[PDB]
């Protein structure tokens, strides 16, 4: 390559190895200069301290700024030393790279500054040595997600209420609607559970209560639900992508059972389907998701650790299969022998893997207790495997949310500061109109703008 110039004579020497076999004109060296070395210590001071290095060492990488003829922009003539106006520390690592070819990266450095000084000198990040590259990439990743959170969000007719419809703590109508719909979800689910209570829809007194009015009590809620979903269909930034999301899926799953049951009872009386309707008559609990801030956090936590939960399920099936088979083959020959089949030993091994314990069926043979205890221990292990991952992800997500809120407050403060700075500059110009070197020409250009439009500036 171009960074092995110091070994150039050695290759020349290697040529002597094939002189006897050589057959050619031997084009002879092309008028090289200074046969004996007259390398001078070129000094590079970077806003302060000075680094001395050779010229061949500094020129072996011509694609960069310290190579090529670009550096001659920074030659400071009356002192004969390149006066770079950069940081006096990172430049040490850049010089180290020129010496070796594998640039390094210490930990105690801000990424923005280090990358700015690295790109200024024309270097590119991928040259970092493999030893420090991992830590560099991790730091770059965390700063990148910080700037992503920086660039995410800002606050901004009939379609405008959507802004208040995703931040209900914005207007009186939005907040009252949010609170009342939460109350309606709650009263619907409570209405379900109190329909189930024996004093609500059971023969408490056959000869005498069973108020069928619950049949109407839920209905209004469903109707109520429709209106806000209709609003979601009215103020929809996306007509189809909104449905592609999951919250609308929960909404429609909540809405449908009432309507499908009405259609069925208008046309059919299928046995076993009305109970399924009752079962599905509960998922408004998930409709509570918008009110609960932590529910979205939990959902994202589960979605993030999908692989871990999948391995949980696989290992659970593993253990259930193995231990249920062992139980059935080691306990089917007992007197009572409630282990009538492996599909029945599934329940025993799943209530002993979870360390639950019911005692409805327990082993009664010495060949049974051993594997029962081993199954309990293995259940502790298997179930405890993914919980640290899940909880770590949840804590991390909660931290991201809280830091994003603090960051948004910080961004509001920063934009306020920028507005204040512009106001201060305008007031300074006003004072200059009433009666530093830079401000002179700045106000001169402002006067030029004033005259080119013949309109003056007031407070």
């Amino acid at each position: 390559a171009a960074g092995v110039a110091a070994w150039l004579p050695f290759a020349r020497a290697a040529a002597i190895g094939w002189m006897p076999v050589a057959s050619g004109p031997m084009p002879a060296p092309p008028r090289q200069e200074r046969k004996r070395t007259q390398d001078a210590l070129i000094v590079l001071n970077v806003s302060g301290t000075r680094f001395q290095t050779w010229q061949d060492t500094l020129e072996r990488y011509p694609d960069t700024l310290l190579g090529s003829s670009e550096r001659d922009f920074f030659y400071h003539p009356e002192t004969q030393q390149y006066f770079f106006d950069r940081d006096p520390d990172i430049f040490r690592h850049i010089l180290n790279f020129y010496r070796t070819g594998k640039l390094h990266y210490p930990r105690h450095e801000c990424i923005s500054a280090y990358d700015e000084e690295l790109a200024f000198f024309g270097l590119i990040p991928e040259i970092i040595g493999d030893c420090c590259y991992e830590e560099y990439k991790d730091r770059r990743r965390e700063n990148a997600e910080r700037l992503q959170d920086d660039a995410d969000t800002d606050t901004a007719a009939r379609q405008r209420v959507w802004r208040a419809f995703e931040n209900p703590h914005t207007s009186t109508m939005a907040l009252v609607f949010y609170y009342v719909t939460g109350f309606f979800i709650a009263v619907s689910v409570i209405a379900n559970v109190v329909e189930t209570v024996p004093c609500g829809s059971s023969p408490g007194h056959i000869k005498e209560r069973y108020a069928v009015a619950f049949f109407c009590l839920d209905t209004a809620c469903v109707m109520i639900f429709t209106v806000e979903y209709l609003l979601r269909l009215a103020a929809a930034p996306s007509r189809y992508r909104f449905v592609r999301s999951v919250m609308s899926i929960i909404d429609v799953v909540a809405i449908l059972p009432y309507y499908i049951g009405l259609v069925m009872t208008d046309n059919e009386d299928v046995s076993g389907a009305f109970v399924t309707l009752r079962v599905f008559r509960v998922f408004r609990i998930f409709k509570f998701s918008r009110h609960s801030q932590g529910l979205r956090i939990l959902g994202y936590t589960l979605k993030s650790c999908a692989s871990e939960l999948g391995f949980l399920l696989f290992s659970l099936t593993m253990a259930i299969i193995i231990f249920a088979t062992v139980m059935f083959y080691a306990e089917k020959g007992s007197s009572a022998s409630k282990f009538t089949s492996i599909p029945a030993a599934f329940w025993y091994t799943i209530v002993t893997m979870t360390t639950l314990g019911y005692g409805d069926m327990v082993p009664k043979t010495i060949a049974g207790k051993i594997f029962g205890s081993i199954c309990s221990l293995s259940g502790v292990l298997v179930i405890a495997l993914p919980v640290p991952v899940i909880v770590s992800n949840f804590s991390r997500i909660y931290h991201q949310n809280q830091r994003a809120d603090k960051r948004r407050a910080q961004k509001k403060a920063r934009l306020a500061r920028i507005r204040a700075a512009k106001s201060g500059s305008a007031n300074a110009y006003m004072q200059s109109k009433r009666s530093s070197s830079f401000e002179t020409q700045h106000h001169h250009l402002l006067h030029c703008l004033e005259k080119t439009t013949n309109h003056e500036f007031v407070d």
Partner: peptide, 28 residues
């Protein structure tokens, strides 16, 4: 803040009245 709570009071009393009317009309 509290005005929104009064708005809740209004909407809840309205819905309670209408559902009371609904439950009162049916058992004829």
């Amino acid at each position: 803040a509290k005005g929104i709570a009064i708005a809740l009071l209004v909407i809840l009393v309205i819905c309670s009245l209408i559902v009371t009317s609904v439950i009162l009309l049916t058992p004829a």
